[PDB]
Design an enzyme around this catalytic site. Structure first.
Site, PDB file in Angstrom:
ATOM      1  N   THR A 202       0.813  -1.202   0.000  1.00  0.00           N
ATOM      2  CA  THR A 202       0.000   0.000   0.000  1.00  0.00           C
ATOM      3  C   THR A 202       0.855   1.263   0.000  1.00  0.00           C
ATOM      4  OG1 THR A 202      -1.944   1.129   0.985  1.00  0.00           O
ATOM      5  CG2 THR A 202      -0.351   0.137   2.537  1.00  0.00           C
ATOM      6  N   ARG A 203       0.264   2.335  -0.526  1.00  0.00           N
ATOM      7  CA  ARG A 203       0.820   3.686  -0.469  1.00  0.00           C
ATOM      8  C   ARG A 203      -0.194   4.671   0.122  1.00  0.00           C
ATOM      9  NH1 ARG A 203      -1.924   4.819  -5.379  1.00  0.00           N
ATOM     10  NH2 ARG A 203      -2.023   6.975  -4.599  1.00  0.00           N
TER      11      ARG A 203
ATOM     12  N   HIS B  39      -9.294  -2.224   3.935  1.00  0.00           N
ATOM     13  CA  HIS B  39      -7.964  -2.798   3.749  1.00  0.00           C
ATOM     14  C   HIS B  39      -7.633  -3.811   4.833  1.00  0.00           C
ATOM     15  CE1 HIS B  39      -7.364   0.460   0.831  1.00  0.00           C
ATOM     16  NE2 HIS B  39      -7.892   1.245   1.752  1.00  0.00           N
TER      17      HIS B  39
ATOM     18  N   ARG C  69      -7.760  -4.627  -7.193  1.00  0.00           N
ATOM     19  CA  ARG C  69      -8.115  -3.835  -8.363  1.00  0.00           C
ATOM     20  C   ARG C  69      -7.120  -2.675  -8.569  1.00  0.00           C
ATOM     21  NH1 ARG C  69     -11.412   0.833  -6.569  1.00  0.00           N
ATOM     22  NH2 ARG C  69      -9.323   0.731  -5.613  1.00  0.00           N
TER      23      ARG C  69
ATOM     24  N   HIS D 265      -7.911   1.821   5.772  1.00  0.00           N
ATOM     25  CA  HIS D 265      -9.233   1.929   6.341  1.00  0.00           C
ATOM     26  C   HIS D 265      -9.732   0.515   6.664  1.00  0.00           C
ATOM     27  CE1 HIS D 265      -9.125   6.172   5.270  1.00  0.00           C
ATOM     28  NE2 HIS D 265      -8.700   5.810   4.073  1.00  0.00           N
TER      29      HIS D 265
END
Ligand SMILES: Nc1ncnc2c1ncn2[C@@H]1O[C@H](COP(=O)(O)OP(=O)(O)O)[C@@H](O)[C@H]1O
Ligand SMILES: Nc1ncnc2c1ncn2[C@@H]1O[C@H](COP(=O)(O)OP(=O)(O)O)[C@@H](O)[C@H]1O
Ligand SMILES: Nc1ncnc2c1ncn2[C@@H]1O[C@H](COP(=O)(O)OP(=O)(O)O)[C@@H](O)[C@H]1O
Ligand SMILES: Nc1ncnc2c1ncn2[C@@H]1O[C@H](COP(=O)(O)OP(=O)(O)O)[C@@H](O)[C@H]1O
Lengths: 529, 522
Positions: free
Chosen positions: B168-169, B176, B263, B173
């Site tokens: 992740t970057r 995730h 996605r 929330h």
């Protein structure tokens, strides 16, 4: 046609007295007091006519301007920004005595009294004469609530009110003041004039904007608008206890009040340099009741109201907020309305949300930049936005156009300091890493910021450490600066005499030095972590 | 190393060098030579045949590259001149932006953040043997900055034979958290939360806020016996499908047996014509074709949507940044409270956001009078104001500067710099200078976030000084409007004609605009 007239700039106090004179707040007075009215007011609380007026209202004048005033001449009274407010005929110029006036009006000559201290700056002569108004001071805060005596009387009328209680205050209003005023309405059987002072109160009061916002939110949300009027009074308080209480009664009467609230310690500045209270807690109520009939305004007196948890109500004693406003936090619902507490919390933020300036001073290659960088990282990792004013940033954005004289270097320090002090004003963290060799220049920067918000760090290193620390040739020349680089000599470094943090860089790694500044910041409460 | 030539490398290259040095890019151990580079660009493979889908090269400006000698050792220094490695100059070659961008990224559109950055890269690539002097040193959360060796050790300490990794970057929330914990349950092993703290995409949530989010979320919500948190100093390429494969390689080198691919994985969004750079599941399809060769199993997810009537995230069966820049508070079904308050700390409500009112216009136009009035109106509404008017600027900021075009530009840029720092800390700053040069005011605008620079044209005619000047300079006379011309703004946020509006009305009009934008909630 004021352009041919001699002009004087008057103090902020005199602008406020002039404003209230012009709108009829001091009726029967319509001008600054002449010698006879003045001396009788001082001695007997009475105008020469015999009309009660407890507080002298005069226009001070420096002896160097007084010397050339001419009897019968018209002068322009201008405000501190040079805006012309009134013309005055100079009919009287007379000498006053500070200690006589203070002793009689204030009961004291102790300069711990805020007005006594101010009187020492007043010009040695008072001047008096007929006034012609050019314009009233113009305000751009809450002009809707800045109402003349005429506007307030017309508003009492419109609401169909026959009785009106007036409330004086210079303080935020809490739930005790809210209860105080509402008990007073029901008791007298009339409406209420909330009449807070926005002119001059006492040094160190809550700022006027915060207070005005408090009065506005409390009025609009918690008061019955058919029975309540809010109006801001541009009064320059004297803090004269009983005499000022009487004065307040006369003023509020001219605004159309039939009743005036007087509580505990009314219009009092507190205690003198001996610790003795300036006035007895109910000396004001006492004087007021003796004169209430002559003035034509009825006193609604209160003894000190206290909160009783068992009742959840505010009762008379017969039955402060120092942990909250400081590093502390929000007042509870039973002491303060949430909207007011919120306004206070915006103004008085917790200490771990307050701005501060970490100023790192020391010899070239002492390690200021390295430590600054590390501390900036540590601060940011703790959720703080940081402005880092190091050599490169300053030389790029701030220093261009300045030379390398002592003066230009002091200018540069003061420039960096002004910027840092504006960031601290907005609750930002600034880190400054400059050699900043001159102690007075640095002291000056300390004086630009609120006390406790200037963290001076002494980054201590041996003389000429650059080479030892592998900074040589042109890199050392860059570090030393022009004078030192070319002559081998410079002005001596003047160390912080008492810095917040001292860091001995021969003993601590720059990370340890940074950690040391951090532990100081936690100690003071600037970081909770 | 004192006899050697030194060169300063970019932040991107520092990060590539760090990851090369700790073995994150294994089997790669140096910046790519020309043969490796071209076969990576063209077919995602090193010259040898080994899969490497993203080129790792070291740009050098044409003038420095020309003075490099074949076989010589140079010192590679970071942007602050700290020596990180020595490198032998074995290759110096030109590259082609269109060649590299179209093949690796699928596009040459400058809207693509990497394409835009590539136009700033030096025109030559350098390659050769590396000898490390030291790794970059960090002072934020060193406990979570873990090498491949360290993550592989911690995996063993937990006794986990399968580990799913999460890239992740962004802030995490509930979507995730549920995405990672579900991935973990499918695989039947542990979890490696592996957020990127190196370089991501411009306009991303700042790295400090993000790290604090990952740390609190990991500390209070994840089973420590099966979850590992590690910060990855990756300089992302935002290259979608190709980057997905790369992430797989990297995470495998950290000890991951499995890799989440959701996605639009590693996509920067849409191009100039408003079209997605990549298809939403192209990354999952590419990864599936190479996963066996890579030696890491993909755990693919369909796009997870929140269904309120269930209080659950589902993969469609049977954005947010636009409200961060508005300071809106996120609901507990969407975000954990600790993350919401961290985001609220850095993204304050709009009416508490910092902004710059920049009053430009001719002398005597009334900039200072208007600014003073506005200051009072703003202060009355509960905003602290820095007033950078003529006298404040001349006392504190512009001493030593004269009246030459250069010095006037320097002065505009200086007040702009000061205003930008105040804005950074959510302060209100009102500036009132003639500031006659349009390019310089535009440079000041670019110092601040979009929407935070309120340029106000105080429009008065040239000869308005006739009735208004008190100081005497207009009568005596580099004077703007008389000697040197004024350049009015093309599109100011606010415009006030001062021959019609009183100074109070002009300020009221600025207030109105600030209310409309929501900077002032009264
Ligand atoms: N706890 C209290 N009990 C009774 N009266 C109070 C109390 N607090 C304030 N008052 C009264 O309410 C008014 C509020 O005054 P304040 O703003 O505190 O200072 P000042 O008397 O100088 O205006 C005064 O008339 C004061 O006497
Ligand atoms: N305590 C120390 N011991 C050894 N080297 C140091 C120390 N502090 C700083 N240095 C090194 O000295 C050089 C100069 O430090 P710098 O932080 O730029 O000093 P300044 O900003 O005071 O001129 C840097 O290369 C730094 O790494
Ligand atoms: N709503 C969602 N449904 C499925 N996968 C998602 C969703 N949101 C994010 N992801 C996936 O989680 C990972 C992290 O996403 P993001 O923070 O955008 O990083 P990146 O840009 O590196 O893909 C990616 O694999 C992404 O595809
Ligand atoms: N309609 C108006 N708008 C702005 N200023 C005016 C207007 N009418 C008169 N002035 C006066 O012009 C004088 C110079 O204004 P100032 O604000 O110093 O201009 P600037 O700062 O743009 O040089 C002031 O005394 C101001 O009161």
């Amino acid at each position: 046609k004021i352009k041919y007239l001699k002009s004087i700039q008057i103090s902020q106090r005199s602008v406020l007295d002039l404003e209230l004179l012009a709108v009829g707040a001091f009726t029967p007075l319509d001008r600054f007091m002449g010698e006879e009215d003045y001396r009788n007011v001082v001695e007997s609380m009475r105008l020469k006519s015999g009309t009660l007026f407890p507080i002298p209202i005069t226009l001070p004048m420096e002896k160097e301007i007084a010397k050339d005033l001419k009897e019968g001449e018209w002068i322009v009274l201008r405000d501190p920004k040079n805006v012309p407010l009134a013309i005055m005929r100079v009919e009287e110029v007379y000498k006053w005595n500070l200690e006589y006036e203070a002793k009689n009006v204030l009961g004291t000559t102790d300069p711990r009294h805020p007005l006594v201290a101010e009187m020492h700056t007043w010009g040695e002569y008072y001047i008096s004469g007929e006034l012609k108004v050019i314009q009233l001071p113009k305000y751009y805060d809450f002009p809707e609530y800045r109402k003349t005596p005429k506007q307030v009387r017309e508003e009492i009328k419109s609401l169909g009110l026959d009785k009106i209680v007036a409330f004086q205050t210079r303080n935020p209003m809490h739930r005790v003041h809210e209860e105080l005023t509402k008990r007073a309405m029901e008791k007298v059987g009339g409406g209420l004039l909330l009449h807070p002072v926005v002119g001059l109160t006492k040094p160190g009061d809550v700022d006027v904007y915060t207070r005005m916002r408090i009065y506005k939110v409390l009025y609009e949300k918690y008061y019955d608008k058919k029975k309540t009027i809010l109006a801001f009074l541009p009064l320059a308080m004297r803090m004269a206890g009983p005499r000022e209480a009487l004065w307040h009664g006369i003023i509020r009467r001219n605004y159309g009040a039939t009743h005036f609230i007087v509580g505990r310690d009314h219009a009092s500045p507190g205690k003198d340099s001996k610790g003795k209270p300036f006035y007895d807690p109910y000396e004001a109520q006492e004087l007021f009741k003796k004169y209430e009939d002559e003035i034509g305004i009825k006193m609604v007196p209160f003894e000190e109201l206290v909160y009783v948890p068992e009742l959840d109500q505010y009762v008379e004693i017969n039955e402060i907020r120092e942990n909250f406003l400081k590093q502390g936090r929000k007042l509870p619902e039973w002491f303060t309305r949430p909207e007011v507490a919120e306004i206070l919390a915006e103004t008085y933020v917790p200490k771990h949300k307050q701005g501060f300036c970490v100023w790192l001073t020391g010899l070239p290659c002492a390690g200021k930049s390295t430590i600054a960088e590390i501390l900036a990282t540590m601060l940011q990792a703790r959720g703080r936005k940081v402005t880092l004013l190091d050599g490169d940033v300053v030389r790029t954005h701030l220093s261009r156009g300045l030379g390398f004289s002592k003066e230009d270097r002091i200018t540069n320090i003061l420039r960096v300091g002004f910027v840092a002090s504006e960031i601290v004003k907005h609750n930002g963290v600034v880190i400054c890493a400059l050699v900043s060799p001159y102690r007075s220049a640095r002291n000056q920067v300390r004086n630009m910021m609120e006390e406790g918000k200037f963290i001076e760090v002494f980054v201590d290193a041996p003389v000429e450490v650059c080479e030892e620390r592998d900074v040589k040739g042109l890199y050392k020349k860059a570090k030393e600066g022009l004078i030192k680089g070319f002559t081998g000599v410079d002005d001596p470094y003047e160390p912080p005499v008492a810095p917040e943090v001292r860091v001995d860089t021969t003993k601590l790694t720059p990370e340890e030095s940074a950690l040391k500044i951090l532990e100081f910041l936690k100690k003071e409460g600037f970081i909770k972590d």
